[PDB]
Amino acid sequence: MPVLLGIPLLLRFLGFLLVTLFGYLLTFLKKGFGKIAIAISLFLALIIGLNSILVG
């Protein structure tokens, strides 16, 4: 299906930006699931900590 000389490269580029940008969203998602790991850890560590004082 005949096309001009530059259209096939505009169509390949408009799906490079999309995969790059959808690649960044993934990186940031994974980071925010690491915050909920730090948070949980902290809480349970403060509980185990108080126990050791009171029983002493």
Partner: protein, 56 residues
């Protein structure tokens, strides 16, 4: 506030207290004052870990 509402036990009501007091009496009182402090540090530190949900 606690500086001008201050009073001390008269000196005649000592011979009494020092006939009835066990050895673990005053040591126990101090515990009731240390358990309080501990819970205040737990509370403040538990509210700083909840600020990790302000960035979402």
């Amino acid at each position: 506030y606690l500086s001008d509402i201050s009073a001390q036990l008269p000196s005649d009501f000592v011979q009494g207290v020092q006939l009835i007091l066990p050895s673990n009496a005053l040591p126990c009182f101090y515990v009731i004052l240390s358990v309080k402090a501990a819970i205040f540090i737990f509370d403040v530190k538990q509210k700083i870990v909840s600020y990790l949900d302000w960035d979402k």
